[PDB]
Amino acid sequence: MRKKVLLMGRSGSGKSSMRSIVFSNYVAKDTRRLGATIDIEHSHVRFLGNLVLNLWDCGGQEAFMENYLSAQRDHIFRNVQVLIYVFDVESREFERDLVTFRNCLEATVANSPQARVFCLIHKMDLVQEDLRDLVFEERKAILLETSKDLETTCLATSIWDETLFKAWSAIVYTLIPNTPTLESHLREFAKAAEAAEVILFERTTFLVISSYSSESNPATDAHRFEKISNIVKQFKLSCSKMQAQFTTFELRGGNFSAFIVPYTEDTYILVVIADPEIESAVTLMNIQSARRFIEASKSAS
Amino acid sequence: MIKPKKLSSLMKQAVEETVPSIMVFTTTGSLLAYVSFEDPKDGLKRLDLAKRVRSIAALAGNMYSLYTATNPSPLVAESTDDVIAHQRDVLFETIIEFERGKLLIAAISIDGAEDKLYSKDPLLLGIVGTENAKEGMMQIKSELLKECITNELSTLGKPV
Amino acid sequence: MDSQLSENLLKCVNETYRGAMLVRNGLPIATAGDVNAEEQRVICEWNSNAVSEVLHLHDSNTKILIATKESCVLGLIYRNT
Amino acid sequence: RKIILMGLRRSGKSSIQKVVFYKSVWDFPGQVDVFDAAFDFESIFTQVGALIFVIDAQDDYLDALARLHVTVARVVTINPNICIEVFIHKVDGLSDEFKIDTQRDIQQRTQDELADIGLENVPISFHLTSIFDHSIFEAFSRVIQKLIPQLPTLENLLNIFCSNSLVEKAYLFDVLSKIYVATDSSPVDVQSYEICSDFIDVILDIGSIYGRSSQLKPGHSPEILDETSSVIRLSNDLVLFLREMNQYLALICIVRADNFEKSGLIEYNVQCLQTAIQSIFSPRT
Amino acid sequence: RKREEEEEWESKVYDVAKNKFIDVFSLRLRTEAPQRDPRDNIYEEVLDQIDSLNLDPKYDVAKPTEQETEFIIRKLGVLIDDINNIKLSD
Ligand SMILES: Nc1nc2c(ncn2[C@@H]2O[C@H](COP(=O)(O)OP(=O)(O)O)[C@@H](O)[C@H]2O)c(=O)[nH]1
Ligand SMILES: Nc1nc2c(ncn2[C@@H]2O[C@H](COP(=O)(O)OP(=O)(O)O)[C@@H](O)[C@H]2O)c(=O)[nH]1
Ligand SMILES: [Mg+2]
């Protein structure tokens, strides 16, 4: 199963930085040494087994993207699953960006009429904090006026905080099929194991595939998933400095207990128990019961 | 899936004055569930009791694991070698007597499957006694708790 | 300890048998009356072929009524005087 | 007692307090030194037991060495119980051959002028620091170990705990500053110290996310919370585990997973070490 | 005058924590070892030559009457029924 994802945007908007940080295990300080992307850099990402993401890291320069809409129009915009257009919020040519975004939208509608548009308004860390909301809603009122042709969500991203993983989790959540089945599986696992919060990650990129939070969840932060993803990616890089693979995490807090163990061959599961009376050794094989069940299910199938 | 509240309700009815604590743990000392005679109301009165029960289970699992590699069954009952071939025995009860208490470690033979929810470590039932406790009543309580926990854990391998 | 076994053990003790001693083949299960100053280990270690015996210590004056069937021994404590 | 971070201009002191202190440490500026009477230097230097001088390795340091020597003479004439440490800084851009030659040149230039002055009784230590590495945390830990008068008792306790429990390496971190109060007699690997420093980051961040109910109650917690204990098993037959010792301390130990099969005995020895540490650090008569 | 009392306190609590530890390395299978002292066994015979106590279990047997035998065989059967009538739930 191949999904074709377009990564378009203006010159210097930061598309290769997002591709390197999310998929190629870069950090934010290492993207300053990234060179210019000449034409299109095709990337194949093995994400959740049989599903393969075709990432088309297109060049953002003007002579490249005049060539994209004229000669390579049939090669690029045909069979497009997700179109990602990246907007630099510190760009002084936003009216020049809107016309090019309209041209890319017109080519995408004329070639692949069943596609989803994501407008990532990048470089939000260069905007001061109290102005970081009403500026973004200023652009979000424009692009949603522009993008009435297809389904479009606009997200404010930056590589120096947790919003990048939220945006890329929202991007790859639509590409994963049968997500109500995984949501029902996580709901039944949290009901069976008496867990407050069950979050399923990916093994390599650590993007949040699915999550389920019960009413007994002690966490009140709405941006906790991408924060935990950043935590486990930083610790995976710390383990990879020692040439070792992180396998299991166990915690016993004052009122909680968090367990990060591998679930499938391509996932990690975070299980949080809100009851301190439940020991670690009960939950650490309560997860293994479901792991043995899905191994027995996937052995026959 | 194992419900520790079900195990606590199952072991709460087998607790008297002479038997303060009944706990279920693994051979590595990892505690699963435990009960007590009096329920503490203070937080620290729960914490020191939980630390004491965890230390008791941690020492008792290693004290069971020291004796599990010894087979004294050929050194009794002089008969033919087929009887010795029928003597593949595993430890199932262990009673330790002190001045100010008694300890009983019994391995719970879990049914269902040989690899259902344990990786070659049987669950151990730890029964703590006192000076006025009697060891024969502890064996009856141990076999009742074993035959109830085994039927309770016979429905393991819970799906999704 | 069950309530019906407790009242049965209270029915064991009377003004004649001043002490009741319930024991398995090797381990005690229930005590009533004055069971102290030895007179319990000799009941626990006791084993014989027959089923009905009367035993008293030759360095004491306590006479014990002992029955054994189905791997369960009942001991009754009363003074020889 | 306080810690004074001396040095010259563009030596790296403000970046040190940005990395370590900003995630009693005082930063005197690179100018208006002890010859100037802008501050009561003799009153401050009596109450200060640790003096740290930051020396840039890339820049010329002979004027910095003369300022260091007159500052050492000033603080020895103030009090004889001060500890002097030298922080060789900005070694991130230097090669592996350059660091050893710079350390040898700085130590040979300093320890002979110490004999030329005549104050050979005082001990002066030398440290290789860089703000982009974790060597600044290790150097500040070795500075802090001199000020604590309870270091050999904790070190002997960690030695007998590592020998008894088959623990390869143990540290007594402070979780707020990632500075270890005590360690055992075995040397500190940088690959071990990086994962031991980031273990606290993972624990504190997950406990900040999910420790919202009770935890930070303004009046009082109705139930006393458990100590924060964690276990991480790695793929290279090594297990890292933490146990919260005090309100600000923790004990991270590195143990092989062959020796972590008997984790209950290690847990009992951790509890006995917790009792020993809480009885040492309690107020007494 | 007060630091030495603190040092003595730390020495005695170090001795307490040293005595309270568990030697994990001694707690392993040190078996399949050759013998060390197979000669010092004559102390067993020269101490247990007699030592005034080789005495059998005493329980000096008198003969029971049929009334007490009938009483105890009636009591032991219903106590055995009480034993096998046990239950975990009340
Ligand atoms: N402050 C800030 N800088 C960014 C962000 N994203 C990217 N950058 C910087 O902007 C540059 C963008 O270069 P690049 O990713 O190659 O642009 P591209 O050719 O459109 O892919 C990088 O060197 C980054 O250092 C961001 O979110 N915030
Ligand atoms: N790249 C790099 N720069 C450093 C390092 N240490 C210090 N610096 C720089 O050197 C400057 C030193 O300033 P500093 O002496 O601390 O300012 P002061 O405390 O006010 O005197 C800082 O602004 C840092 O940017 C290092 O290890 N690497
Ligand atoms: Mg690019």
Residue type, D103: Q
Q: At residue B153, what are phi and psi to the nearest 5 degrees?
A: -95, 10
Atom 15 of ligand 1, nearest CA residue? A14
The single residue listed with the structure tokens 């003790």 is: C13
Q: In the listed set D98, D132, D147, which residue is the last one of a domain according to the structure? A: D147
My answer on whether D170 and D245 are in the same domain is yes
My answer on whether A203 and A220 are in the same domain is yes
CA C41 remoteness from chain centre: 10
Say if A188 is an interface residue toward chain B (CB within 8 Å).
yes
Q: In the listed set A175, A206, A229, which residue is the last one of a domain according to the structure? A: A175
Q: At residue B58, what are phi and psi to the nearest 5 degrees?
A: -65, -40
Give how far Cα A117 sits from Cα of A53, A139, D282, Å: 16, 15, 62
Sheet holding D25-27, edge to edge: D25-27, D2-7, D48-56, D83-89, D124-128
Q: At residue D32, what are phi and psi to the nearest 5 degrees?
A: 35, 65
DSSP assigned state of D35: T
* Inter-chain touch B2–A288, beta carbons under 8 Å: no
Contact A86, A7 (CB under 8 A): yes
Q: Which residues contact D65 (CB under 8 A, 6 or more apart)?
A: D55, D109, D110, D113
Give the CATH number, domain containing residue D197.
Answer: 3.30.450.190
In three-state form (DSSP H/G/I as H, E/B as E, the rest C), the secondary structure along chain A is CEEEEEEEECCCCCHHHHHHHHCCCCCCHHHHHCCCCCCEEEEEEECCCCCEEEEEEECCCHHHHHHHCCCCHHHHCCCCCEEEEEEECCCCCHHHHHHHHHHHHHHHHHHCCCCEEEEEEECHHHCCHHHCCCCHHHHHHHHHHHCCCCEEEEEECCCCCCHHHHHHHHHHHHHCCCHHHHHHHHHHHHHHCCCCEEEEEECCCCCEEEEEECCCCCCCCCCHHHHHHHHHHHHHHHHHHCCCCEEEEEEECCCCEEEEEECCCCEEEEEEECCCCCCHHHHHHHHHHHHHHHHHHHHHC
Give the CATH number, domain containing residue A147.
Answer: 3.40.50.300
In angstroms, what separates the C-alpha of B36 from chain A's closest C-alpha? Answer: 13
**Domain range for A11:** 2-175
Does residue D232's CB lie within 6 angstroms of at least one atom of ligand 2?
no
My answer on whether D106 and D17 are in the same domain is yes
Give the integer Cα–Cα distance in Å for A119 and A112.
17
Q: In the listed set D147, D172, D207, which residue is the last one of a domain according to the structure? A: D147
The single residue listed with the structure tokens 């094989």 is: A285
My answer on whether A185 and A280 are in the same domain is yes
- The partner residues of D221 in beta bridges, in order of sequence, read none
My answer on whether D155 and D138 are in the same domain is no
Among candidates A63, A82, A79, which has minimal Cα distance to A71? A63
Give the CATH number, domain containing residue D94.
Answer: 3.40.50.300
In angstroms, what separates the C-alpha of D131 from chain A's closest C-alpha? Answer: 15
Burial of C81 (0-12, 13-18, 19+ CB in 10 A): exposed
Give how far Cα C11 sits from Cα of C43, D131, E76, Å: 20, 84, 12
Give the integer Cα–Cα distance in Å for A163 and A245.
26
My answer on whether D49 and D154 are in the same domain is no
DSSP element (H, E) containing D253: strand D249-256
D234: nearest CB among A220, A245, A253: A245
My answer on whether A159 and A37 are in the same domain is yes
Q: In the listed set A175, A198, A229, which residue is the last one of a domain according to the structure? A: A175
Contact A244, D238 (CB under 8 A): yes
Neighbours of chain B (3+ CB pairs under 8 A): A, C, D, E
Give the integer Cα–Cα distance in Å for B126 and B52.
13
Strand ranges (E), chain E: 60-62
My answer on whether D115 and D209 are in the same domain is no
Neighbours of chain A (3+ CB pairs under 8 A): B, D
DSSP 3-state of D10: coil
**DSSP sequence for chain C:** --HHHHHHHHHH--SSS-EEEEEESSSEEEEEE---SSSSHHHHS---SSSEEEEE-TTS-EEEEEEEETTEEEEEEEE--
My answer on whether D120 and D163 are in the same domain is no
Per this entry, what is the length of chain A?
Answer: 301
Among candidates D217, D214, D207, which has minimal Cα distance to D250? D207
My answer on whether A7 and A79 are in the same domain is yes
Q: Which residues of B26-50 are buried (b: 16+ CB within 10 A; e: fewer)?
A: bbbbbbbbbbbeeeeeeeeebbebb
My answer on whether D177 and D143 are in the same domain is no
My answer on whether A170 and A195 are in the same domain is no
Give the integer Cα–Cα distance in Å for D254 and D247.
22
Give the CATH number, domain containing residue A209.
Answer: 3.30.450.190
Q: Which residues contact A101 (CB under 8 A, 6 or more apart)?
A: A85, A87, A119, A143, A146
Among candidates A213, A253, B41, which has minimal Cα distance to D216? A253
* Inter-chain touch E62–C58, beta carbons under 8 Å: no
**Domain range for D77:** 2-147
The tally of domains found in chain A comes to 2
Residues of E within 8 A of C22 (CB-CB) are 79
My answer on whether D90 and D162 are in the same domain is no
My answer on whether D69 and D180 are in the same domain is no
My answer on whether A103 and A225 are in the same domain is no
My answer on whether A132 and A43 are in the same domain is yes
Distance D198 CA to ligand 3 centre (A): 31
Give how far Cα B107 sits from Cα of A258, B70, B95, B143, Å: 29, 15, 12, 10
Contact D110, D65 (CB under 8 A): yes
Nearest CA in chain B to C25: B136
Q: At residue B89, what are phi and psi to the nearest 5 degrees?
A: -105, 150
In angstroms, what separates the C-alpha of E1 from chain D's closest C-alpha? Answer: 12
Q: In the listed set A158, A175, A192, which residue is the last one of a domain according to the structure? A: A175
The tally of domains found in chain D comes to 2
Atom 25 of ligand 2, nearest CA residue? D15
Contact A272, A248 (CB under 8 A): no
My answer on whether D209 and D253 are in the same domain is yes
My answer on whether D157 and D227 are in the same domain is yes
Q: In the listed set D101, D117, D147, which residue is the last one of a domain according to the structure? A: D147
Say if D131 is an interface residue toward chain A (CB within 8 Å).
no
- The C-alpha angle with vertex E6 and arms to E4 and E8, in degrees rounded to 5, equals 70
Around Cβ A162, how many Cβ atoms within 10 Å? 17
* Tokens representing residue C34 in the block: 């004055």
Residues of E within 8 A of B140 (CB-CB) are 83, 86
Give the integer Cα–Cα distance in Å for D19 and D13.
10
Give the integer Cα–Cα distance in Å for D199 and D210.
17
- Mutation for B interface: C27, C35, C40, C43, most B CBs within 10 A: C27
My answer on whether D183 and D213 are in the same domain is yes
My answer on whether A271 and A129 are in the same domain is no
My answer on whether A166 and A222 are in the same domain is no
Give the integer Cα–Cα distance in Å for D66 and D185.
35
Residue type, B6: K
Nearest CA in chain D to E21: D269
Contact C81, C61 (CB under 8 A): yes
* Tokens representing residue B27 in the block: 């051979």
* Tokens representing residue C24 in the block: 């398995």
In angstroms, what separates the C-alpha of B144 from chain E's closest C-alpha? Answer: 7
My answer on whether A143 and A289 are in the same domain is no
My answer on whether A171 and A183 are in the same domain is no
Resolution of the experimental model in angstroms, please? Answer: 3.1
Distance A185 CA to ligand 1 centre (A): 38
- Mutation for A interface: D206, D241, D270, most A CBs within 10 A: D206
